[PDB]
DNA sequence: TTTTTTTTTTTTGAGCGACTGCACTACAACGTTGTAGTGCAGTCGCTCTTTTTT
């Protein structure tokens, strides 16, 4: 549960950044699809990133 | 004085302060070895209000 909460914290930190760094969610291409980040679309993005971005960190050294 | 065209994004926080690991000597227990304090280095939280006057 601790890693499942820290991953949600990192996802909310990288999607919507602080008041000094522009986050990834502040973009004209993501606001057209959804206006508010629902947890269902968040889990869909998590599943797609686990399906595709896994060999990025699997072969990293 | 006449006239020619062209579709590609990129970037952005760092100093303050603590936690822990590794080393190194000072000093007491058993010349050598275990306990304690300090310093250097890598890693990690955090954080930067409030508003209205013709």
C-alpha torsion angle, residues A52, A53, A58, A60 (rounded to 10): 140
| CA atom of A30 to C1′ atom of B20, Å | 41
Q: Which two tokens stand for residue A30?
A: 């993501």
Alpha-helical regions (H) of chain A: 2-15, 39-52, 54-58
CA distance A41 to A59: 27
Tell me which DSSP letter residue A16 carries: S
> A16 in the Ramachandran plot: left (φ > 0), alpha (ψ -120 to 50) or beta?
beta
CA distance A15 to A11: 6
CA distance A44 to A29: 17
CA distance A47 to A44: 5
Q: Angle at Cα A7 formed by Cα A39 and Cα A31, nearest 5°?
A: 40
Specify the experimental method.
cryo-EM
Look-up of token digits 């980040």 = A37
| CA atom of A61 to C1′ atom of B23, Å | 28
């Amino acid at each position: 549960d601790s890693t499942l909460q820290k991953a949600r914290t990192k996802f909310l930190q990288a999607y919507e950044g602080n008041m000094m760094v522009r986050g990834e969610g502040d973009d004209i291409w993501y606001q057209r699809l959804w206006r508010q980040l629902t947890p269902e679309t968040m889990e869909a993005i998590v599943e797609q990133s686990q399906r595709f971005l896994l060999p990025l960190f699997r072969f990293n050294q």
